[PDB]
Amino acid sequence: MKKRILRVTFNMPYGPEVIREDLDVRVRIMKAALRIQNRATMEIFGLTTQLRESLLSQFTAWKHRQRQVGREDELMIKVSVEAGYSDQGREQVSRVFVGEVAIVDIISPPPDIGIRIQCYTRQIDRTKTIRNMPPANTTFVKFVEWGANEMGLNFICDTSYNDQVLKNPGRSITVASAILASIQDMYMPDVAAFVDDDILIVKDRDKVIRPDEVTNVNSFVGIPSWSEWGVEFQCLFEPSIRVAGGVAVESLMNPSVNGNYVITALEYDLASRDRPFYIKVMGSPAA
Amino acid sequence: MKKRILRVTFNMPYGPEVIREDLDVRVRIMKAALRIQNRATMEIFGLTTQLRESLLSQFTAWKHRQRQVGREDELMIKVSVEAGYSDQGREQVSRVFVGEVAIVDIISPPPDIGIRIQCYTRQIDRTKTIRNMPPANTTFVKFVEWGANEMGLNFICDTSYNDQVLKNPGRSITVASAILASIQDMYMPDVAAFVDDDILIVKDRDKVIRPDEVTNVNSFVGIPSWSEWGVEFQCLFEPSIRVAGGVAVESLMNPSVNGNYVITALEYDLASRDRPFYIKVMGSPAA
Amino acid sequence: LPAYNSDIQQALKWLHNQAPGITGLIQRKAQWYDRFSRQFWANWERDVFH
Amino acid sequence: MLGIFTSLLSSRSFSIVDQNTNQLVAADLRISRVNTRFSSVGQRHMLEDGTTKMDSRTIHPMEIIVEVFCPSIDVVDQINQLLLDRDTLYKVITRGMVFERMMCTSEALNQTPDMISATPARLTFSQVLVQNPKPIMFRNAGDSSMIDRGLALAEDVVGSAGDLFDYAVNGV
Amino acid sequence: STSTIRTGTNNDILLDDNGNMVILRDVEACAQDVRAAMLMRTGENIFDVNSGVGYFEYIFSPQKSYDDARKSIADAILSSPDVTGIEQLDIDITGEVFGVDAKVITIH
Amino acid sequence: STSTIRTGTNNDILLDDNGNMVILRDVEACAQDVRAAMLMRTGENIFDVNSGVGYFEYIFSPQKSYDDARKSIADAILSSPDVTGIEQLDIDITGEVFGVDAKVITIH
Amino acid sequence: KIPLTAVPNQAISFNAGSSYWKIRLYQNMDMMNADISRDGVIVCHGVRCFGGIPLLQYSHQYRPDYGNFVFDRDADWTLFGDGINLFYLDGAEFAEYQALAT
Amino acid sequence: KIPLTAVPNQAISFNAGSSYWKIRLYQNMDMMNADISRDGVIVCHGVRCFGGIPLLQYSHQYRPDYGNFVFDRDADWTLFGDGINLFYLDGAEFAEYQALAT
Amino acid sequence: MANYNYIVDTGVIVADTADVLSDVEAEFRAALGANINLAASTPQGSLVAAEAI
Amino acid sequence: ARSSVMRNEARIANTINPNVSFGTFLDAICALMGIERGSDLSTFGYGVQVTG
């Protein structure tokens, strides 16, 4: 009888504070191939007075220590979410989200005090500015490389538009967050630019980033069906599923929709004491 | 055993019509420090044929007698709301909202016919125009004073920006409603301009309008908690709570959040035959 | 205000009553640390006495 | 229930222990029933072929229901105080079973023509569920870990700079 | 799964003829570990108080129920890294001696 | 967690041979406090009305039931800073006296 | 004054005197000790706990224009909140304190 | 290092040294064997796994500027995570170690 | 091995007992075997406690 | 390893000569001498200013 594993970490100034799966934790994660940054909402129950003091007071959203020695962590803290299974003491955990806390609330009154939290990926850029002048006359790939260096992310680019010359590409970007909107704007809708975890990915719509890591899928909780854009189904927590990766589909109810699909959007509904522990996938035909 | 009082007053042409607490009346009020006007949704049950004919027919939203001798009451009627408690025959009623009816509906079918109403504060200005030319070169405070005289409201202004010269402040304002948007636009977000009841209030974000009327709060239905802007809690109907006023907070479960806060937004949920009789408060640190 | 013991011998316990080996091992460790961590500072303080 | 073989004659069946002070409370309680209930819910997912899979199981607090008789008035006050208590946890020793971290939820008295001298009563306890049921303690206060109390607001009580000096060094 | 160093009838390190400390593999290490764990006495583990068998307030002292001693002994038998559950306890109490019997179930 | 100034069998400040007004620590401070509380009478405490024992309305007056005296005395024993609960109240009324006995439980 | 509590090891942070401080108090054998942080940068490690002796000793620390901290009496974590306090004095107040001290 | 587990045939993929890696470890008869892929394209196949000597033997594979992997001992799938480890070395460290190997 | 440089330019840094104990346990695990029994009962547990103290 | 490390740390903490010390040397200075130079910034007074 395999048990589920769900940890949430906070990079507090003194160190990490990890909330294990033993408490009541509910998380919903939404990921897509777009410029709009990913979101994760957390439900946390049973926090005591000491831990409420430790955590809830650091999501201030005001600014302090104005001298600003450094950046990144001296504004808002980072949260990392990893989920998986555990069988016979053998673990198969995997990471699914990285972000920073943005919005705080209180949901349930006593005798069980629970809080709700909103986290977004790469929200540190909405405050950081641009200090390196963008290239004036260059090709697409060099613009992408400059953006990756400016944000501070490992990047991958593979498009048919790699040898196209742009004039004045980014001379009107105020902060570091509109770089992604710039990159996506030029060649919509075929070129899709998005930031996943810590990687900037720019690619054509129907290309699998890793052709040799196709995950064969044959066990469905949500019956596959035609989705007006491709296919859409649902499964249990599979650590292998990613964004822009490929899937090979074999069905029993609906054998007519078997084929290769490229993943467009994802969903996560992970709970430690409730029924939902799921992943929802929408795909497009693989070119 | 104190009883609750909830009175809704309507100003018909012949006189006032008061719906008392004896009937089934539900009201939700939302107030904030913004240019967007306040709102109130009203649920009224048990209205007979005579009262239905008397009231529902005056919510016309068309125009009658285009000649328009005068203004204000010859377009839309005004509704005033006062709620409180009664103990041993001794009352503590207080007014909480003033507005005009905008939208009409019908909610429940027979045997019990119930209606829903939408009211907004200072909606009379969306029809009235401007006939006094704004000053050309002038300070902020004189622009605010001209706006107050034009709308017809008693005003209070207390800002650090009181001695700044503006050029052509309001030369592109069509009707009387955009005056408030003009006033808020210039020095956003530090300067907050809002209209409460019938008073125009312009002030800095973190200044208490009445320094000597701080209400000490020590009994909360909703446990106080941090809300990434200040504090947020909930209580029974306390007439002392207002917008931009201050509160002194003393807690039991959460004594780490004690302090002085300035009130930002409020919500009212008052019913005469249901459980909700509440007030929700969001606060910001006092400066 | 609360006491602080910091002795190596609280590791020893009442199982090791007829055990010569482990008791000797812990005792020798304790006296080595005494010699080279406490008498050191005592002699050092005495030589800082001007 | 087998297990222990005492050879002690006058033993004790049921007792509520004050886990803070190791003290008995309401020791004079004749007992009519004792019921113990466990509960858990297993989350099942409905597959594609036609089967059905379960991934994990969740455990809720147990509940203990006891029916008692109060032969006096002092017992009734003791029961009411047991219910109203809010800060302590109680350990319950049944016929052969010992449970911990229990805390009373309700009481229900009766006043009927069947019983005049004594009042029949029913009580209910519920376990406070806490992870890591076996704590780890240090004998030395100097070995304790670090607590945060992060980001308090700070307070300013009126007092001159010279006052602190004349109270701290001078003594006054 | 676990391992430990052999100890003699006294709680002392026992060295083989060649003089090598022998690291016991499973099963046997479980036996020695449970035997030792039953002999702690409470309040004697520095850095973890509230572990052991409460001899001087649950067994030797004049009690009322003797159930607390049984639960304490059952706890001490458990908490070993390999023990799964306990099949039997006896608690004889015949005369002046206090007999305790057990048969433990282990994974390996 | 409490303290008080010692008094004699008549409620005055009692001074030692050194004349020192002594701050009694817990337990006997609780005994002195409860003795003073049960003797305070209702309608004597200004700024706190309805506090005290109703001797002239519940005990000395002709009364039917005599549970009111028990409730009032139990309440006056309560409201002390340290009392947790009341173990026994008897109310004998044997002879011409009105015999009252009580045993209280404190945190210590 | 600074809000404290009776725990042998704690570390509270606050925004006082136009700067952001983080202080740490822990019992070490006989006396207390303290760690002081400013702006996320460590300042001192293991400065002791004495009544009337200011915590910050050196000019590159206590101010060009900042403040300083002082205990009224030799602190112990059993009495925190009851007779033992920690006070913060801004630049002018601390300067006059030092002037009057000698 | 490489977080590994005790399985007779397994695979690992990660981002190391500003590049993507994919290592497939499997038992073959007696010795351990591995297959190395970088950035989706194969590098070498069926490399016998041994202690100390690196997995990449050839210059055009391990680096113009990339790194390499080294086992401390002969691998054994029943010991992984327990006294046996795999380490990744960047360009500079591995160049130093290779020079030391002579 | 697991030594810490706790004497720096700003002063001396003292660690909490949990961290020291975990470091000592890791050191003994590396010494003997990754599955050893380190509890109050076993002799190696007493050695670990002595070292930590 | 452990005994070597504790002896080394004792020898590091022991030697506190002014020509050997570092950082804690500020205390050896404050034993007799005035403490280090506080960082300071030079202000301007009476800078002219003309406008409407």
Q: What is the resolution of this structure in A?
A: 3.6
Name subunits touching H (3+ CB pairs < 8 A). A, I
Pick from A98, A268, A274: which is nearest to A199 by CA? A98
| DSSP state at residue D36 | E
- Tokens 């075929």 correspond to A190
Q: Are B239 and B84 in contact (CB under 8 A)?
A: yes
Q: Which of A152, A115, A113, A117 is nearest to A29 (CA)?
A: A117
Contacts of A253 in chain D (CB under 8 A): 48
Query: How is residue F30 written in tokens?
Result: 């609780």
Q: How far apart are CA A81 and CA A10, in angstroms?
A: 9
Question: Backbone phi, then psi, for B272, in 5-degree steps?
Answer: -95, -15
Query: Can you read off the two tokens belonging to residue G102?
Result: 């000698």
The position carrying tokens 């002038």 is B138
User: Is H13 touching A (CB cutoff 8 A)?
Assistant: yes
Report in angstroms the alpha-carbon separations of B60 from B47, B64, B104, E78, G24. Answer: 18, 9, 9, 80, 68
Per-residue burial over A103-123, b = 16 or more CB atoms within 10 Å of its CB, e = otherwise: ebebeeeeeebbbebbbbbbb
Place of tokens 């377009």: B75
Residue with the two structure tokens 């950082």: J23
Any bridge partners for residue B158, and if so which?
Answer: B203
**CB-based contact A8:A40 (threshold 8 Å):** no
Which of I13, I17, I21 would best serve as a mutation to test chain D binding (most D beta carbons within 10 A)?
A: I17
Assigned token pair, G55: 């915590």
Name the residue among G88, G94, G86 with its Cα closest to residue G16: G88
Residue type, B174: T
* Cβ within 8 Å, pair G60-J38: yes
Question: For residue B116, what are the contacts with CB-CB under 8 A and spacing of at least 6?
Answer: B41, B42, B43, B104, B105, B106, B107
Q: For residue I21, what is the nearest residue in chain D, using CA coordinates?
A: D143
| Separation CA A21–CA A81 (nearest Å) | 11
CA–CA distance, D64 with D34 (Å, rounded to integer): 7
Instruction: Give which of E47, E50, E58, E65 to mutate to test D binding, by max D Cβ within 10 Å.
Output: E65
- J10–C32 CB contact, under 8 Å: no
Chain E residues with beta carbon closer than 8 angstroms to that of I42:
4-5, 33, 36
Chain B touched by A56 (CB under 8 Å): yes
Spatial separation of the C-alpha atoms in residues B253 and B268, rounded to whole Å = 24
In DSSP terms, D121 is beta-bridged to: D68, D109
CA dihedral B49, B55, B57, B62 (to 10 degrees): -170
Q: In whole angstroms, give the CA distance from residue B24 to residue B116.
A: 12
For strand A231-235 and strand A3-12, is the pairing parallel, antiparallel, or unpaired?
unpaired
| Rounded Cα distance, G71 and J41, in Å | 31
Query: How far is residue A184's CA from residue A34's CA, in Å, rounded to a whole number?
Result: 8
Q: Give the separation between CA H98 and CA A36, rounded to whole angstroms.
A: 47
The CA distance from H9 to D95, in Å, is 54
Rounded Cα distance, G11 and A54, in Å = 10
Tell me the C-alpha distance between I40 and A187, whole Å. Answer: 67
**Distance of alpha carbon A29 from alpha carbon A269, whole angstroms:** 7
CB of C22 within 8 Å of any CB in chain E?
yes
Cα–Cα distance for residue pair B40/B99, rounded to 1 Å: 8
One-letter identity of residue F60: F
Distance between CA G49 and CA G53 in Å, rounded?
8
Enter the tokens of residue A52: 């409420």
Structure tokens at H63: 């680096």
Q: Does C44 touch chain J (CB under 8 A)?
A: yes
Contact D78 F88 (CB under 8 A): no
Q: What are phi and psi of A143, to 5 degrees?
A: -60, -45
User: How many CB atoms are closer than 10 A to CB F2?
Assistant: 16
- Judged on CB neighbours under 10 Å (0-12, 13-18, 19+), B6 is buried
**How far apart (Å, rounded) are the C-alpha atoms in residues J16 and A264?**
65
Q: How many other β-carbons are positioned within 10 Å of the β-carbon of residue A50? A: 12
What is the C-alpha to C-alpha distance for residues E37 and F39, in angstroms, rounded to an integer? Answer: 58
Residues 6+ apart with CB under 8 A from H89: H67, H68, H69, H70, H97
Interchain pair D138, I17: CB under 8 A: yes
Burial of B285 (0-12, 13-18, 19+ CB in 10 A): middle
Residue type, H89: L
B93 vs B5: CA distance, rounded Å:
7
Which residue, among D24, D32, D25, has the nearest Cα to D119 in the 3D structure?
A: D32
Cα–Cα distance, H28 to H32 (Å, whole number) = 6
Residue numbers in C near G78 (CB within 8 A): 1
Structure-block tokens of residue E71: 């639960």
Indicate left, alpha or beta for B48 from its phi (over 0: left) and psi (-120 to 50: alpha). Answer: beta
**DSSP characters for chain F?**
---EE-B-SSSSB---TT-PPPEE-TTHHHHHHHHHHHTS-TT--TTSTT-S--IIIIISS--SS-HHHHHHHHHHHTTSSSEEEEEEE-----TTS----EEEEE--
Between vectors from CA A165 to CA A161 and to CA A166, what angle results, nearest 5°? 105
Q: Which residues of B135-163 are buried (b: 16+ CB within 10 A; e: fewer)?
A: eeebbbbbbbbbbbebbebebebebebee
Spatial contact of B286 and B270, defined as CB atoms under 8 Å apart: no
DSSP E37-74: HTT--SS--TT-BS-S--IIIIISS--S--HHHHHHHH
Residues B40, B119 contacting (CB under 8 angstroms): yes
Which residues on chain D are in Cβ contact (under 8 Å) with E51?
A: 134
Q: Are A272 and A24 in contact (CB under 8 A)?
A: yes
Which residues of chain H make contact with I35, given a CB cutoff of 8 A? 82
G and C adjacent (3 or more CB pairs under 8 angstroms):
yes
CB B194, CB B204: distance < 8 Å: no
- For G6, nearest residue in chain D (alpha carbons): D147
Give the span between the Cα atoms of H40 and H58, in whole angstroms.
19
> Mind giving me the DSSP string for chain A?
--EEEEEEEEEETTEEEEE-TTSEEEEEEEEESSSSPPEEEEEEE---HHHHHHHHTS---S---TT--S-STTTS-EEEEEEEEEETTEE--EEEEEEEEEEE---B-TTS-EEEEEEETTGGGGT-B--SPPPSEEEHHHHHHHHHHHHT-EEEEE-TTTT-EEES-STT--BTTHHHHHHHHTTTTTEEEEEETTEEEEEETT--S-TT-PEEE---SEEEEE-SSSEEEEES--TT--SS-EEEE--SS-GGG-EEEEEEEEEEEEESSSS-EEEEEEEEE--
Residue A177: both structure tokens together: 């967050």
Q: Are strands D119-127 and G19-28 parallel, antiparallel or unpaired?
A: unpaired
Closest CA to A217 of A259, A253, A250: A250
In single-letter form, the type of residue at position D149 comes to: R
Residue H2, burial from CB neighbour count under 10 angstroms (0-12, 13-18, 19+): middle
User: B239-243: which pairs have CB atoms within 8 A and are 24 or more residues apart?
Assistant: B239/B84, B239/B92, B239/B94, B240/B213, B240/B215, B241/B215, B241/B266, B241/B279, B241/B281, B242/B196, B243/B31, B243/B32, B243/B33, B243/B194, B243/B196, B243/B201
DSSP D137: B
Q: Is D145 on the interface with I (CB under 8 A)?
A: yes
Structure tokens at A207: 């290309």
* Cα gap B242→B231, rounded to integer Å: 16
Hey, how many other C-beta atoms are within 10 angstroms of the C-beta on D15? 18
- Please say whether the beta carbons of A136 and A65 come within 8 A: no
Amino acid identity at E52: G
Query: Could you tell me the CA-to-CA distances from G35 to A112, G10, G29, G30, I15 in Å, in that order?
Result: 36, 11, 16, 17, 12
Report the gap between the CA of E37 and the closest CA in chain D (Å).
Answer: 16
Using only C-alpha atoms, chain F has a radius of gyration, in whole angstroms, of 16
Nearest CA to D53 out of A256, A249, A85 is that of: A85
How far lies B54's CA from each of A101, A223, B50, B65, in Å? 54, 58, 6, 20
Taking residue A48's Cβ as centre, other Cβ atoms within 10 Å add up to: 9
Structure token digits, residue I32: 């003997």
User: Does H78 reach chain I within 8 Å, measured CB to CB?
Assistant: no
CA–CA gap between residue B285 and residue B262 (Å, rounded): 6
Neighbors of chain B with 3 or more C-beta pairs under 8 Å:
A, D
Give phi and psi for B128, each to the nearest 5: -70, 145
Which amino acid is located at A97 in the chain?
Answer: F
Q: Which residues contact A135 (CB under 8 A, 6 or more apart)?
A: A142, A143, A146, A169
Q: Which residues pair with F27 in a beta bridge?
A: none
What part of F 49-88 touches D (C-beta under 8 Å)? 70, 74, 84-88
Q: Does G11 touch chain A (CB under 8 A)?
A: yes
Structural contact between residues B230 and B197, judged by C-beta atoms closer than 8 angstroms = no
Which residue carries 């009107």 as its tokens?
A172
Report DSSP state, residue J25. Answer: H
Measured between CA atoms, the residue of chain D closest to residue B256 is: D152
For residue F84, the chain D residues in CB contact (below 8 A) are: 81
Return the C-alpha torsion angle E12, E14, E15, E16, nearest 10. 180
List, in sequence order, every residue forming a beta bridge with H41; answer none if it has no partner: H38
Asked whether D148 and G11 are in contact (CB, 8 A), the reply is: yes
Distances (CA, A) of B58 to B15, B117, B137, H54: 13, 12, 44, 90
The CA distance from G70 to B95, in Å, is 51
Q: Please report how many Cα atoms fall inside a 13 Å half-sphere around the Cα of residue G63, on the Cβ side.
A: 19
How are beta strands F23-24 and A78-87 bridged, if at all? unpaired
Interface contact H83-I34, CB threshold 8 A: yes
Q: Are G5 and G26 in contact (CB under 8 A)?
A: no
For residue H40 the two structure tokens come to 């989706």
Distances (CA, A) of H41 to A123, C44, F69, H23: 34, 66, 94, 12
Q: Do D56 and A2 touch (CB under 8 A)?
A: yes
CB D98 within 8 A of CB D36: no
Smallest Cα–Cα separation from H101: which of H68, H78, H76, H77? Answer: H68
Question: What are the start-end ranges of the E strands in D60-157?
Answer: 63-70, 90-93, 98-109, 119-127
Inter-chain CB proximity C36 and J14 less than 8 Å: no
B96: closest CA among B265, B241, B277? B241
Quick one: which of A95, A87, A83 has its CA closest to A236?
A: A83
| Residue pair C16/C10 in contact by the 8 Å Cβ criterion | no
> In H29-77, where does DSSP find H-type helix?
59-62
Cβ neighbors of I3 (< 8 A, separation 6 or more) are J1, J5
Residues 1-53 of I with CB under 8 A from D: 16-18
Are residues F66 and F91 in contact, defined by beta-carbon separation less than 8 angstroms?
A: yes
Residue B285 CA: distances (Å) to CA of A157, B254, D77, J16: 47, 17, 47, 49
Nearest to D93 among E51, E65, E79 (CB): E65
Which residue, among G32, G36, G26, has the nearest Cα to G57 in the 3D structure?
Answer: G36
Chain-chain contact of D78 with F89 (C-beta, under 8 angstroms): no
The position carrying tokens 């068998």 is E53
Give E78-97 as a DSSP string. Answer: S-SSSEEEEEEE----BTTB
Listed as own residue / partner, the contacts of H25-28 with beta carbons closer than 8 Å and 24 or more positions apart are H25/H49, H25/H75, H25/H77, H27/H77
> Smallest Cα–Cα separation from B80: which of B197, B245, B232, B213?
B197
Contact indicator for B181, B122 with CB cutoff of 8 Å? no
